[PDB]
Amino acid sequence: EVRTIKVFTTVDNINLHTQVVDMSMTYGQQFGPTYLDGADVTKIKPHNSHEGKTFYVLPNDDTLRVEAFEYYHTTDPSFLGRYMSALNHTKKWKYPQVNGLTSIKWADNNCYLATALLTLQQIELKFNPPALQDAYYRARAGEAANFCALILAYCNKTVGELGDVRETMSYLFQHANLDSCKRVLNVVCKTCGQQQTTLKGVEAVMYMGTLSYEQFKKGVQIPCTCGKQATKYLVQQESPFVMMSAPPAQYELKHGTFTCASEYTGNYQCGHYKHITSKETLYCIDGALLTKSSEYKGPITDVFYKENSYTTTIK
Numbered sequence: 209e210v211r212t213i214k215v216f217t218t219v220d221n222i223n224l225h226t227q228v229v230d231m232s233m234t235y236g237q238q239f240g241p242t243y244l245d246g247a248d249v250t251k252i253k254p255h256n257s258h259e260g261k262t263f264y265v266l267p268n269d270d271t272l273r274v275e276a277f278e279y280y281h282t283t284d285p286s287f288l289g290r291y292m293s294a295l296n297h298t299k300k301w302k303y304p305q306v307n308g309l310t311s312i313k314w315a316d317n318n319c320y321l322a323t324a325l326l327t328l329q330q331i332e333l334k335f336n337p338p339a340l341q342d343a344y345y346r347a348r349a350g351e352a353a354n355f356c357a358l359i360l361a362y363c364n365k366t367v368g369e370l371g372d373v374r375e376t377m378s379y380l381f382q383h384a385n386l387d388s389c390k391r392v393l394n395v396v397c398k399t400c401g402q403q404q405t406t407l408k409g410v411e412a413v414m415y416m417g418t419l420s421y422e423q424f425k426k427g428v429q430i431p432c433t434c435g436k437q438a439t440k441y442l443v444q445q446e447s448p449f450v451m452m453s454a455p456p457a458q459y460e461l462k463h464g465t466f467t468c469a470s471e472y473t474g475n476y477q478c479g480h481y482k483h484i485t486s487k488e489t490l491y492c493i494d495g496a497l498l499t500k501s502s503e504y505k506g507p508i509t510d511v512f513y514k515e516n517s518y519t520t521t522i523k
């Protein structure tokens with residue numbers, strides 16, 4: 209016998225293609241790799257209840273490969289599989305509204321995603337792939353499963369693998385409109401002289417050395433090839449924000465002096481991230497848990513500061 213039902217196949221969940229499927233054959237035998245809300249149904253055969261639902265298929269024709277690229281801004285043929293793999297787990301996460309922000313309830317080493325999400329809700333970042341733009345707007349409302357699964361997909365991470373926030377944000381900043389972001393630094397050695405350097409894009413809003421945006425304006429000590437301590441200071445900053453990073457060290461966060469910060473407790477590649485945010489007072493957002501305080505000491509590895517345009521007054 210041959211009975212059939214009507215389903216929708218997609219790569220983006222915007223352009224739905226209308227397929228008639230043989231129920232006496234599998235989804236894998238008809239389309240190839242097929243996913244329903246993340247779940248791999250390749251070896252599964254069609255069911256009565258499946259009639260009228262949307263299924264993600266691999267872009268295995270010239271039409272779907274163009275729709276895929278235009279949406280995800282990647283031609284990596286493993287991408288959709290790794291997104292669907294991740295999504296299948298992240299749809300079972302709880303996304304509670306903590307301090308009027310979308311956070312994640314701890315599960316499968318997602319502490320770094322939770323702080324990365326809370327950060328992205330607080331800084332002005334414009335994503336280029338329509339996939340992230342769409343997923344993020346849902347994430348703000350509290351439907352963050354599609355966003356988290358994309359972050360894991362874009363960053364080449366499996367569910368349960370702890371990730372570096374600075375490494376994660378770097379990846380996402382590649383897929384962000386940071387075009388007109390500009391940074392001018394002046395390095396001054398007492399023997400060698402002066403050196404100015406201009407940085408455009410992701411390079412302009414990321415520094416690895418110090419957490420203090422004040423110290424980066426005042427000046428920081430760096431080893432010149434002279435074998436003498438040279439001073440590097442910020443001449444000019446043109447960006448919606450700056451991300452100051454350093455390896456985890458005991459640091460004092462003062463109310464008003466920053467936007468948000470990533471606290472890391474534990475040892476390399478096996479610790480625990482928490483989100484510290486500055487509002488009417490300091491709040492520590494620990495996944496679904498929330499503590500507030502006036503003062504804060506702790507092992508901070510990232511601070512994010514808002515910006516528009518800065519020009520130095522050092523001579």
Ligand SMILES: Cc1ccc(N)cc1C(=O)N[C@H](C)c1cccc2ccccc12
Binds near residue numbers: 375455509
């Ligand atoms: C969580 C994670 C996942 C993947 C990778 N590749 C790295 C990390 C990670 O350890 N990050 C923290 C902030 C860190 C960074 C730099 C130096 C550190 C030295 C000592 C302790 C922590 C340190």
Ligand SMILES: [Zn+2]
Binds near residue numbers: 398399432
């Ligand atoms: Zn020198």
